[PDB]
Design an enzyme around this catalytic site. Structure first.
Site, PDB file in Angstrom:
ATOM      1  N   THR J   1       0.844  -1.232   0.000  1.00 16.67           N
ATOM      2  CA  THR J   1       0.000   0.000   0.000  1.00 16.67           C
ATOM      3  C   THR J   1       0.864   1.260   0.000  1.00 16.67           C
ATOM      4  O   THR J   1       1.865   1.340   0.714  1.00 16.67           O
ATOM      5  CB  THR J   1      -0.960   0.026   1.210  1.00 16.67           C
ATOM      6  OG1 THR J   1      -1.919  -1.031   1.076  1.00 16.67           O
ATOM      7  CG2 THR J   1      -1.712   1.354   1.306  1.00 16.67           C
ATOM      8  N   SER J   2       0.463   2.231  -0.817  1.00 15.85           N
ATOM      9  CA  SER J   2       1.085   3.547  -0.845  1.00 15.85           C
ATOM     10  C   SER J   2      -0.012   4.597  -0.737  1.00 15.85           C
ATOM     11  O   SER J   2      -0.875   4.685  -1.611  1.00 15.85           O
ATOM     12  CB  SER J   2       1.865   3.737  -2.143  1.00 15.85           C
ATOM     13  OG  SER J   2       2.871   2.750  -2.272  1.00 15.85           O
TER      14      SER J   2
END
Ligand SMILES: [Mg+2]
Ligand SMILES: [Mg+2]
Ligand SMILES: [Mg+2]
Ligand SMILES: [Mg+2]
Lengths: 125, 196, 195, 226, 232, 204, 212, 222, 195, 196
Positions: J1-2
Site C-alpha cells: 500500500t502507498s
C-alpha cells in the site's frame, strides 16, 4: 429484585408478619414430642376431613433429616418442605466437612437460623 | 549505512556516510566505508563489518597477486572475485558490497553484489539500510553522462536524504572520485549537507 | 492411584484396589483404602490424580446419601453410574477437570443381579463382566478372558482374582503393596480381611 | 472449492463447483455451495463449510426479520454490513469467506468478504482454492457491458478452470442468475461434465453370503393399546 | 540450507505443432522491493535449447556459468560439435536434473525451479521441468511458481492433451503465451511488465525476443469502483 | 491425544428402493486396549436413526441430549420428528459449541413417514451437513468405507440385497482398521418394519 | 505386534502374530515376523521391520562365515553377541529393534537371547516383546512348566498370541508357530486368528465375554 | 529451513496371478493442490521381465528406479548375462533402500514379474527396505481405499457360501488376466471418484512368459 | 539398572545388586546378575543405561584379564579403580558417553585389607566404608551411619545389609525383585545363594 | 500500500494506489483506499483491511451522530475520534490511518495516526509499505501553498515511484480533492504514470 420490607416493627414493638406466621401454626394439625429414658416418640394428628386419600403416597408428617434425626411440624405444609430440604442438605454438608453427623442441637440451630433470616430479609415472608 | 556508486562522463564516484552503530549507540561516528582493493578499483561495504573487512582484505590480496602475474585487473574481474567469496560462503556471511572502478578501455563501471552473492552491472547502485529512503529520489534524478560536479551534487543530495531519515546513517559524507586523472578524496561536513 | 480391578460373578461384584500411596520418592502409606460406599448395596473404587480422587469420591458419596434420605429409597446401580458419568462428562470441559477413574460395583435388589460399571475421567461408561483402569487390564484381561464364566461362585471369583494379582506382582515394575478386596451382594458390602 | 461472481448488463451471476473435501478425501460429490440469504440475495462460501452455512443462515434470518420490520425488500449492503461486523467481532475464528451478490430496489451488487471482516467491491470476483485458476479465465475474457448469456458463459468457464485444474474443486457447475426486475433463477447442476463411466463388473452378492448370529424385529412403534 | 535472497518469479511454456515456446519476465526482487529491472532469466544453449529459471538469482547465475562451461567442454576433442555431436535439449536437462538432486541430497540446494525447452535432432519437441528438490515431470504445458496456478489453466485450454499439439500453430501458441504473461502482471505482486520470449522451431530454428511489454491492458473499469461497500 | 481416535469405531448408512440401511461396529477401546465389544453406536428416536462415531463420552452425552430434545419435541408437536427436521436439529446443536465442540461424527438415517422418501445425512464435529443420495460414512476407518461404498454401491437395491452390500462394506473396512471391529450391527429400515442383524466377524 | 519365545524340555517354541500397522491403518495381515536366520537359528521381528529383516539376514551371513572358518556350528551366545555388538555401534543413530535370537546346540542346549537396539543382551527362559506383550505374558506365566510336551507347548504359544491378538488393537491377522530342536527348527503352520478364535472359544470354553 | 522431501501423490497397484502379474499406476503428478502433469509414467519395465514402481516423493522414486535399472545392467556384466530372478531383484532393492537408512528414499516400492517356477510374483517394500512377497498390494495416496476392496473381491474375505450361513467359506478360485484387469480398472475408477490426487489416466503393465505388455485407460480429469 | 550397594567390613567387601530388568512396561527378567569378576580378588557391580552397562563392564573385564596374563600378576584394587576412573573420565567428553555407575569391591592381598571404591559415570572416585548409586543411598545411609563399625565380621555385615534391603523394600516404589549378594575376601569371590 | 495526503493553497488532496495483496497474490487490483467519513473529511487506510474498515465505519457513525447534534465537525475532531479507537485498542489493531479534511475556518489539514495511536498534525503525510521509498523524494519536492495542478503532479509523481519499487503497491492511482468548491475524484492509469 423485589426488596420490600414485609417484616417490620409496629409502634408497640411487635413484628406482625412473624406473629401472623404463628397463627398459621395454630391452624395446623397437632404435633407432639415426648422423650423417655432411652427413646423419643413423635406423635402427629391426621384430620379425617380427607378420606379417599391414598395413604401410601400422601406426604407423611414425620420426615427423616438424617438416619438419626427426624423432623415433624405444624403449619403450612408447602413451607415445611423448604425447611426440610435445607436441613437435609446441611446434614450431608456437615458429614462431608466435619466427618461426623450433626448433633440434634446443631441441626435445630441451623433450621432456627433459616427461620430468623426470613424475618429480617427484604422481599420475603 | 548509506552507500552508493555512480558512473559519469569521466569515470565513477563512490559515496558513503561515516556512522557505525551497535544497536542505538554510535560506536564510530567517523568511519571510512570506502575501501581500496586496487589503485582504481574501490568498494563500498554494508552488512557485517567483520565480514566485509575480511572479504575486502582477501580481494585486495587476490588482485595484488593477479597484478604481479597478469597486469592490471578489470573491474569485472574484481567483481567476480568478490562474487566468488560471497556466493560460495553465503551461509556464513552477511555482506552487501558495491564494486566501482575505472579502466581506460571500459571507463567507469559499477557492480552491485547483494546478500545472495549475485552480480548486477548497473549505471549506478545504492545499498545499505539508508538506501531504501532514496530509491524514488535517485531514479528521478540520475542521468547518464553527467559531469564531475553534477555527480558530486547527485551523491551529496542523495546521501543527505538517506542520512536525514535513517538513524543508522550519519556523520560526514565521504567520496572517492575515479578518473583517468587519478584518485581524489572528498569530505563534506554536517553544516554543509544538512542545509541542502 | 494405581491398580483397581473388578469382576461380576453369579451373585456378587468383587472390587480389588491397591494399598500403596506414593508421593514421588517415598511410599508414605501401605494400608490406604481407595473406595467409598455410596449406598448399602453400591461401592465405588477410584484412581487418578492426588487429592481429586478423594474429593470426587466423597462428593459423589454425599450426593447419593442426600438422594437416599430425600426419597427414602436406594437408587439402582445403573442410575448411580449414570449420575457419576454425567458428573465426569461435565467435568472434562471445566476450567480444571477431575482426573479420576472409577469402578462402580452394585447389587440390584429389584432385578436380583450384580452389576459392574467402568467409567473413566472423560465420562466413558461401559457395563462389563470384569474391568480395570490404567495398566491393570493389560496384565489381567488375558487371564479373565480365559477363565471367566457367568455362573461362577464368589469363591471362584476370588481365586481368579488371586491369579490376576499374582500376575501383577510378577510383571509390574511398581510395588503396590497388595490389595484390599471387597464383596458386594444381596446382603450389602463386606471386606475380605485376609488376602 | 471454486466460486465466482460476475456483473452484467441488467444484473449479476454467481457460480460454484460441487465438491466438498476432508483433507484429500471427497466427502460429497454433489455439494450445494450456492446459498440463499434472501430470495434475490445469494452467496457462495469457501473455507470452513459449517461457518459459511451458519453465518449465511443467521444473517439470512435477521435480514428476513429486518425486511418484515421495515416493509422493504432486503438490500445487499445490509447483508454485507451485518456479515462483516459479525465476522470482525470473532477476529477470524469464524472461517467464512464469501462472495455476496444480489438485486434490490437500489440496483445490482457484487461484494466479497473475508473471515476477519474486510470487504471489497468488484465487477468480477473469485474465491477458494481454485480462485487463481478462475481469475485467470476472468482476467482473459471479461469486458464491460456483458449480456446475460455472456456472463453465464464466462462464470461457468471460470468454474470449469477450477474443476479441471484445482484438486480442491470438481464435479458439477451450479449457477444462480439475479436480474433486475425478475425472479432469481437458481440453476442446480447447470453443467454435468463428470459422470462416472459404467463399471466393468456388478458387485451384487448372492443372498446368504454374510454370516449372521442373531435376527430380531425392532419395535419402532409406540406402546400399543389393549 | 539457506534462504533465497534476490529472486525471479514465474517461467511459462508450451508445445505446438512444430516446436516449443518459453517466456519469463525481467525482474529481480529483493523481498517486496522490486530491486533489479533488467534481469534476463531465459538462457539459450546453442540453437536448439532455452533454459528458463526462477527462484534465487545468485544460484541462477551459477547455473548459467555451468551451462556455459558445458558448451566449452562438449566442444573439446569433438569434430562434430556443431553437427551430430551437438548438445541436445535432453542432454542439458538430464545434467541439470542430476545436479539439482545431488545438491538437495547434501542438504545444500540450488534454490530454483527450471524449465528446459527445445527441439531434438529428429524434430521432436522437448519440454521438461526440474526444481530444488530434484523433482522432474513433462507435460504439453509447463509453468513455475504463480504461472503454475494461473498460466497452466489458460495454456491447457489450447493444448489439453497430446493429440492437440499437431492442431496448434505457432501464432495460436504465442498468442496464448503473451496473454498468460498479461494475466500474471495483473495478479502477481512480484512480476514486471517487461519480459523475454523464445521460440524454438524445427524449421525456423531459435527466435529470441527481448524487451517485450505487456500491452492491451484493461484498467478503465477502475474509475467506477468506489469505497468498499456502502460509499457512493 | 487426538480426541476423535481415542476410542475408535465406525458408522455407515445407505439408501435403497423404498428403504434405508445403517450399520456400525461394536468396539470401544482406550487406544490399543480393547475395553468393550458391546458398545453400540446407533440409536433411534421414533423412526429416525442416529449413528455417532468419535469420543465415546460425547457419543453417550449426545444420545442423551437428543433423546431429551426429541422427547420434548414430541410432547409439544404431538408427532414424531422426521429425518429432515432432526438433521437440522443435530446441525444446530453441534454449532452451538463452535469453539468447544463435541468430538463426534454423527450420521442420520430414516424414511419420511408422509412422503415415503428414503433419507440419509452426515455431519462434521461442528455441524456441517452432508446430504448424499447414495451413502454416508464416519469414523476411524472412513477412508476404507469410502473405498468399499464407491465400488460396491448401486442405486435402487432391494432391502435384502442392500443388507448384503452394506454388511460387506462395513466388515471389510473394519478389518483394515486397528481401532474398529469386535462385532457389528446392521439395521434394515422400511416404512413400517425395521430388522436388526448382528454379524459374525473376526475378533482381533 | 506380539512375539514370544520360551525354553522347555523339548526345545524352544517361537510364536508371533502377523499384523503391521501405520497409525490406525492396517498395512498388512500377512507379515512374516519370524526371520529364518539359518536352518538352526530363528529371530523375531519387533520395532523396525527393516532393521530386524536387514540385520538378522546379515547375521545369517556372519554365522555362515563363522562355520566355514571354524568348521563348527556357531553358539547361540556368539551369534546373539555379533548382533548386539553391531547395534551397539549404531547406538544414538535411531535403530529400532527388539528381538529374540533362538537356537539349540550341544554345548548350550535350548537357548534364547533378548537383543535390543540400545545394546541390551539378556539370556532367559521366557521373553515377550511388542505392543501386546503383557497379554501374552499372562497366559505364559500361569501355564508354563519345563516338562510341557511338544504338543502342549505349541498350543500354549498359539494361545498366548491369540490372547494378545484379541485385546491388542495392533496385533492380529494370523499366528505363525515354530518348534526349535537340536537338529533344526520345524515350521508348524499359519493359523488365521479369525478362524482360530472361534475354534478355541468353542473347544476351550474361553472368551465367554464374546458372543459367537 | 530447507525441507529435502516432497509429496507427488499417485497410487499404484500390483496383483499376482497364477501364470501372470500386473503392476498398475495412475499417470497424474501433483504438488499440493496443483497438477504438474496428466501423463507422467510411473511404472517402468526394468528388463529381465521385471516391472517396478517407487511411489511417493518422485525425485527419490526416479533415483531408485534409475539405480535398480543400473544394478540389472551390472548384474549382467558381472555374472555372464544371467537373468536376474524376481527374488534376487527384491533382495537387491532392500540393500539399495537400507543404504540410506538414516536419510531414506521417501517412497513405497513395488515390483512385479514371474518367479523361477513361472508363477506370478509381487514384492512390496517400505522406505528403508523391509520387504515381503505378496499376492495383492496397493500403494500411495488411495491405498487405504483400494486394499479393503481387494481383500473382499480377490481373497473373498467375509464371503461365505449361501445356505451354510458362515460355516463354509467361498472357495478361492483362480482369476484370469481379463478378470484381474477388470478389478484393477474398477479399483482406480472408484479411487478417482473419492481421492483428489487420483485421476487423468491409468497405465497397466502386464507380465507373462511372452514378455511385458502395456494397456492404457482414461480416468476422470477433475 | 537400579539398586547397587556395598559395605567394607573387617576382612571382606560385600556387594548387593538387584535382580530385576525392566523394559518400560514389563519386567523381562527377575534373576539378572549385575556384576563382573575383573580378577580373582576384585569384583565390579554396575548400574546405568541399558546396553552400555554390560558393554562397559565386559570391556573393563577384558582389559584387566589382559593385564593379568601379560604380567602374570593381579593389580591391586586401588590400581584397578584408577584405571576404571580414567576410562569414565575419558568417556564423559566423548561423542556418546558411557552412562554407567560402578562399585569396585576388592581384597588387597599385599596389605591384607578389604577396599571399596565408588565411581560414577563422570569419573568421580571415592574410597568408602560403605557406598551406593542412584537413590539407594537415600534410604540406606542413615542405617549404615548408625550401625557400622570398622571391626564388624562378615556375618554382621550381612545382617546390616539385610536391614538396608528391608528398608528399600518398604519405602521404594519400584519392585527390584530382591538382590544377589557376593562376598570378596582373601579366598576370592563367592555368592550367598540364600538371601 | 502507498498512501498520502498533501495540503495546498485551496485545501487538501488525498492519494492512493489500488493494490490489495494476500502474500504475493493480488486479491484486488482496483481497490478504493480513499474512504469518506464525512462530506469533506476523508481518510487513507493502511494495515489490516478488516481493522481499518471497522474503524472507518465506526468513525463515520460517530461523525454522523456528532453532525446531527453539534453541526459539522472539525478535521481535528475527526482525527481525535480515530485516535481514541486506535490508542485504546492498540493491542488488538494493526492500523495506520491518515486523516485529511477541509474546513472554511481552518482550510486544508492533515493528521497522521501511526500504529501506536499517536496523533501528528503535518503539512503533508505519507504511509503504507511503499512510503519508505519516497521519504527522500517527498522531502525534497514538497512546498507549502502549491496550486491544485502542482499538488496533483506531486502526488502522481510520488506514488508513481512508490508503486515502481514496492511490490505490495500498484494498479491505478486514485485521488480525492477537498476544497471550498466541493469534492472531486481523479483516477490515473498505468500507461499514464509509468512513463513519468
Ligand atoms: Mg479391525
Ligand atoms: Mg487385535
Ligand atoms: Mg480424483
Ligand atoms: Mg508494483
Amino acid at each position: 429484585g423485589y426488596d420490600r420490607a414485609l417484616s417490620i416493627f409496629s409502634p408497640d414493638g411487635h413484628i406482625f408478619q412473624v406473629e401472623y406466621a404463628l397463627e398459621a401454626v395454630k391452624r395446623g394439625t397437632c404435633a407432639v414430642g415426648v422423650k423417655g429414658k432411652n427413646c423419643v416418640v413423635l406423635g402427629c394428628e391426621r384430620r379425617s376431613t380427607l378420606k379417599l386419600q391414598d395413604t401410601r403416597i400422601t406426604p407423611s408428617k414425620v420426615s427423616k433429616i438424617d438416619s438419626h434425626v427426624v423432623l415433624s411440624f405444624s403449619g403450612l405444609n408447602a413451607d415445611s418442605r423448604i425447611l426440610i430440604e435445607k436441613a437435609r442438605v446441611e446434614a450431608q454438608s456437615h458429614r462431608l466437612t466435619l466427618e461426623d453427623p450433626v448433633t440434634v442441637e446443631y441441626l435445630t440451630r441451623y433450621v432456627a437460623g433459616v427461620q430468623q433470616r426470613y424475618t429480617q430479609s427484604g422481599g420475603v415472608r | 549505512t548509506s552507500i552508493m556508486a555512480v558512473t559519469f562522463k569521466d569515470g565513477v564516484i563512490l559515496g558513503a556516510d561515516s556512522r557505525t552503530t551497535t544497536g542505538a549507540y554510535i560506536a564510530n561516528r567517523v568511519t571510512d566505508k570506502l575501501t581500496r582493493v586496487h589503485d582504481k578499483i574501490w568498494c563500498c561495504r554494508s552488512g557485517s563489518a567483520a565480514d566485509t573487512q575480511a572479504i575486502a582484505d582477501i580481494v585486495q590480496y587476490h588482485l595484488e597477486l593477479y597484478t604481479s602475474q597478469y597486469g592490471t585487473p578489470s573491474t569485472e574481474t574484481a567483481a567476480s572475485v568478490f562474487k566468488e567469496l560471497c556466493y560460495e560462503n553465503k551461509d556464513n556471511l552477511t555482506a552487501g558490497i558495491i564494486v566501482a572502478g575505472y579502466d581506460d578501455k571500459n571507463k567507469g563501471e559499477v557492480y552491485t553484489i547483494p546478500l545472495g552473492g549475485s552480480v548486477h552491472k548497473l549505471p549506478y547502485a545504492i545499498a545499505g539500510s539508508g538506501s531504501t529512503f532514496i530509491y524514488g529520489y535517485c531514479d528521478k534524478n540520475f542521468r547518464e553522462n553527467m559531469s564531475k560536479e553534477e555527480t558530486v551534487d547527485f551523491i551529496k543530495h542523495s546521501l543527505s536524504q538517506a542520512i536525514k531519515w535513517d538513524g543508522s546513517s550519519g556523520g560526514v559524507i565521504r567520496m572517492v572520485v575515479l578518473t583517468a586523472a587519478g584518485v581524489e578524496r572528498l569530505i563534506f561536513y554536517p553544516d554543509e549537507y544538512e542545509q541542502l | 492411584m494405581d491398580i483397581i480391578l473388578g469382576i461380576r460373578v453369579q451373585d456378587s461384584v468383587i472390587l480389588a484396589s491397591s494399598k500403596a500411596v506414593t508421593r514421588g520418592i517415598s511410599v508414605l502409606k501401605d494400608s490406604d483404602d481407595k473406595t467409598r460406599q455410596l449406598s448399602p448395596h453400591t461401592l465405588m473404587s477410584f484412581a487418578g490424580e492426588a487429592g481429586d480422587t478423594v474429593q470426587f469420591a466423597e462428593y459423589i458419596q454425599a450426593n447419593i446419601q442426600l438422594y437416599s434420605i430425600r426419597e427414602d429409597y436406594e437408587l439402582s446401580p445403573q442410575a448411580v453410574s449414570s449420575f457419576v458419568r454425567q458428573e465426569l462428562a461435565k467435568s472434562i470441559r471445566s476450567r480444571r477437570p477431575y482426573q479420576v477413574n472409577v469402578l462402580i460395583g452394585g447389587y440390584d435388589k429389584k432385578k436380583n443381579k450384580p452389576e459392574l460399571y467402568q467409567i473413566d475421567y472423560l465420562g466413558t461408561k461401559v457395563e462389563l463382566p470384569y474391568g480395570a483402569h490404567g495398566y491393570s487390564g493389560f496384565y489381567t484381561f488375558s487371564l479373565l478372558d480365559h477363565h471367566y464364566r457367568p455362573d461362577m461362585t464368589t469363591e471362584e471369583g476370588l481365586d481368579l482374582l488371586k491369579l490376576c494379582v499374582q500376575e501383577l506382582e510378577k510383571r509390574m515394575p511398581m510395588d503396590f503393596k497388595g490389595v484390599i478386596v471387597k464383596i458386594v451382594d444381596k446382603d450389602g458390602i463386606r471386606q475380605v480381611d485376609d488376602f | 472449492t471454486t466460486i465466482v461472481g460476475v456483473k452484467f448488463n441488467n444484473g449479476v451471476v454467481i457460480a460454484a463447483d460441487t465438491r466438498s473435501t476432508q483433507g484429500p478425501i471427497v466427502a460429497d460429490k454433489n455439494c450445494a455451495k450456492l446459498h440463499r440469504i434472501s430470495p434475490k440475495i445469494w452467496c457462495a462460501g469457501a473455507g470452513t463449510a459449517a461457518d459459511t452455512e451458519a453465518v449465511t443462515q443467521l444473517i439470512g434470518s435477521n435480514i428476513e426479520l429486518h425486511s418484515l420490520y421495515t416493509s422493504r425488500e432486503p438490500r445487499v449492503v445490509s447483508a454485507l454490513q451485518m456479515l462483516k461486523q459479525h465476522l470482525f467481532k470473532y477476529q477470524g475464528h469464524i472461517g467464512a469467506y464469501l462472495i455476496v451478490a444480489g438485486v434490490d430496489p437500489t440496483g445490482s451488487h457484487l461484494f466479497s468478504i473475508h473471515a476477519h471482516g474486510s470487504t471489497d467491491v468488484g465487477y468480477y470476483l473469485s474465491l477458494g482454492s481454485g480462485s487463481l485458476a478462475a481469475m485467470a479465465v476472468l482476467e482473459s475474457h471479461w469486458k464491460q457491458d456483458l449480456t446475460k448469456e455472456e456472463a453465464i458463459k464466462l462464470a461457468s468457464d471460470a468454474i470449469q478452470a477450477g474443476i479441471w485444474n484445482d484438486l480442491g474443486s470438481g464435479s458439477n457447475v451450479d449457477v444462480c442468475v439475479m436480474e433486475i426486475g425478475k425472479d432469481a433463477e437458481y440453476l442446480r447442476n447447470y453443467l454435468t461434465p463428470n459422470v462416472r463411466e459404467e463399471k466393468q463388473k456388478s458387485y451384487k452378492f448372492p443372498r446368504g453370503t454374510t454370516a449372521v448370529l442373531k435376527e430380531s424385529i425392532v419395535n419402532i412403534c409406540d406402546i400399543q393399546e389393549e | 540450507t539457506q534462504q533465497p535472497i534476490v529472486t525471479g518469479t514465474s517461467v511459462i511454456s508450451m508445445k505446438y505443432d512444430n516446436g516449443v515456446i518459453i517466456a519469463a519476465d525481467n525482474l529481480g526482487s529483493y523481498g517486496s522491493l522490486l530491486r533489479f529491472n533488467g534481469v534476463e532469466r531465459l538462457i539459450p544453449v546453442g540453437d536448439n535449447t532455452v533454459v528458463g529459471i526462477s527462484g534465487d538469482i545468485s544460484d541462477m547465475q551459477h547455473i548459467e556459468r555451468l551451462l556455459k562451461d558445458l558448451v566449452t567442454e562438449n566442444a573439446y576433442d569433438n569434430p562434430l560439435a556443431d553437427a551430430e555431436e551437438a548438445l541436445e535439449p535432453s542432454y542439458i536437462f538430464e545434467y541439470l536434473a542430476t545436479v539439482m538432486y545431488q545438491r538437495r541430497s547434501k542438504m545444500n540446494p540450488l534454490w530454483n525451479a527450471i524449465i528446459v525447452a527445445g527441439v531434438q535432432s529428429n524434430g521432436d519437441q522437448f519440454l521438461r521441468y526440474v526444481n530444488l528438490l530434484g523433482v522432474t515431470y513433462s507435460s504439453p504445458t509447463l509453468a513455475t511458481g504463480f504461472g503454475a496456478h494461473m498460466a497452466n489453466p489458460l495454456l491447457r485450454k489450447v493444448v489439453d492433451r497430446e493429440s492437440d499439439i499437431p492442431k496448434t500453430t505457432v501464432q495460436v501458441a504465442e498468442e496464448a503465451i503473451v496473454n498468460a504473461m498479461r494475466v500474471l502482471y495483473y495478479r502477481d505482486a512480484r512480476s514486471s511488465r517487461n519480459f523475454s520470449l523464445a521460440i524454438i522451431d524445427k524449421n525456423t530454428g531459435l527466435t529470441f525476443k527481448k524487451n517485450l511489454q505487456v500491452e492491451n491492458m484493461k484498467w478503465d473499469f477502475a474509475k467506477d469502483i468506489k469505497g468498499y461497500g456502502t460509499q457512493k | 491425544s487426538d480426541p476423535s481416535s481415542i476410542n475408535g469405531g465406525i458408522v455407515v448408512a445407505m439408501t435403497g428402493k423404498d428403504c434405508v440401511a445403517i450399520a456400525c461396529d461394536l468396539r470401544l477401546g482406550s487406544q490399543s486396549l480393547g475395553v468393550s465389544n458391546k458398545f453400540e453406536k446407533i440409536f433411534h428416536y421414533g423412526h429416525v436413526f442416529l449413528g455417532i462415531t468419535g469420543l465415546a463420552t460425547d457419543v453417550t452425552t449426545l444420545n442423551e441430549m437428543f433423546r431429551y430434545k426429541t422427547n420434548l419435541y414430541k410432547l409439544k408437536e404431538e408427532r414424531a420428528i422426521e429425518p429432515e427436521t432432526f438433521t437440522q436439529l443435530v446441525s444446530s446443536s453441534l454449532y452451538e459449541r463452535r469453539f468447544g465442540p463435541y468430538f463426534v461424527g454423527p450420521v442420520v438415517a430414516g424414511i419420511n413417514s408422509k412422503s415415503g422418501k428414503p433419507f440419509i445425512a452426515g455431519f462434521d464435529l461442528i455441524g456441517c451437513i452432508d446430504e448424499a443420495k447414495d451413502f454416508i460414512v464416519s469414523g476411524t476407518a472412513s477412508d476404507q468405507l469410502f473405498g468399499m461404498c464407491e465400488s460396491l454401491y448401486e442405486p435402487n437395491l432391494e432391502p435384502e440385497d442392500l443388507f448384503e452390500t452394506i454388511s460387506q462394506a462395513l466388515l471389510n473396512a473394519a478389518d483394515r482398521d486397528a481401532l474398529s471391529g469386535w462385532g457389528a450391527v446392521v439395521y434394515i429400515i422400511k416404512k413400517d418394519e425395521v430388522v436388526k442383524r448382528y454379524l459374525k466377524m473376526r475378533q482381533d | 505386534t506380539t512375539t514370544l519365545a520360551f525354553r522347555f524340555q523339548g526345545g524352544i517354541i517361537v510364536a508371533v502374530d502377523s499384523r503391521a500397522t501405520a497409525g490406525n491403518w492396517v498395512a498388512s495381515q500377512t507379515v512374516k515376523k519370524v526371520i529364518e536366520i539359518n536352518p538352526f537359528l530363528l529371530g523375531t521381528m519387533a520395532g523396525g521391520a527393516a532393521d530386524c529383516q536387514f540385520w538378522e539376514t546379515w547375521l545369517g551371513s556372519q554365522c555362515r562365515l563363522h562355520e566355514l572358518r571354524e568348521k563348527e556350528r556357531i553358539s547361540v551366545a556368539a551369534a546373539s553377541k555379533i548382533l548386539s555388538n553391531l547395534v551397539y555401534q549404531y547406538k544414538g543413530a535411531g535403530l529400532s529393534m527388539g528381538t529374540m535370537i533362538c537356537g539349540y546346540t550341544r554345548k548350550e542346549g535350548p537357548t534364547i537371547y533378548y537383543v535390543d537396539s540400545d545394546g541390551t543382551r539378556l539370556k532367559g527362559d521366557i521373553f515377550c516383546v511388542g505392543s501386546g506383550q503383557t497379554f501374552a505374558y499372562g497366559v505364559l506365566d500361569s501355564n508354563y512348566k519345563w516338562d510341557l510336551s511338544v504338543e502342549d507347548a505349541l498350543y500354549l504359544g498359539k494361545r498366548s498370541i491369540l490372547a494378545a491378538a484379541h485385546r491388542d488393537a495392533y496385533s492380529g491377522g494370523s499366528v505363525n508357530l515354530y518348534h526349535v530342536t537340536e537338529d533344526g527348527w520345524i515350521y508348524h503352520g499359519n493359523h488365521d486368528v479369525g478362524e482360530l478364535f472361534w475354534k478355541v472359544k468353542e473347544e476351550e470354553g474361553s472368551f465367554n465375554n464374546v458372543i459367537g | 529451513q530447507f525441507n529435502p522431501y516432497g509429496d507427488n501423490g499417485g497410487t499404484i497397484l500390483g496383483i499376482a496371478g497364477e501364470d501372470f502379474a500386473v503392476l498398475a499406476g495412475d499417470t497424474r503428478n501433483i504438488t499440493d493442490y496443483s497438477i504438474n502433469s496428466r501423463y507422467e509414467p510411473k511404472v517402468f519395465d526394468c528388463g529381465d521381465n521385471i516391472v517396478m514402481s517407487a511411489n511417493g516423493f518422485a525425485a527419490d522414486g526416479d533415483a531408485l528406479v534409475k539405480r535398480f535399472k543400473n544394478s540389472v545392467k551390472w548384474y549382467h556384466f558381472d555374472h555372464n548375462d544371467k537373468k536376474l530372478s524376481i527374488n534376487s531383484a527384491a533382495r537387491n532393492i532392500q540393500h539399495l533402500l537400507y543404504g540410506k537408512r538414516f536419510f531414506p528414499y521417501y517412497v513405497h516400492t513395488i515390483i512385479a514379474g514371474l518367479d523361477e517356477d513361472g508363477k506370478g510374483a509381487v514384492y512390496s517394500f517400505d522406505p528403508v527396505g523391509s520387504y515381503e512377497r505378496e499376492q495383492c498390494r496397493a500403494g500411495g495416496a488411495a491405498a487405504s481405499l483400494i486394499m479393503p476392496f481387494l481383500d473382499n473381491q480377490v481373497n473373498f474375505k467375509n464371503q461365505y457360501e449361501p445356505g451354510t450361513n458362515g460355516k463354509v467359506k467361498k472357495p478361492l478360485k483362480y482369476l484370469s488376466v481379463e478378470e484381474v484387469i477388470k478389478l484393477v480398472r474398477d479399483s482406480f475408477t472408484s479411487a478417482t471418484e473419492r481421492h483428489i490426487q487420483v485421476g487423468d489416466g491409468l497405465e497397466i503393465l502386464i507380465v507373462t512368459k511372452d514378455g511385458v505388455r502395456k494397456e492404457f485407460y482414461e480416468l476422470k480429469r477433475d
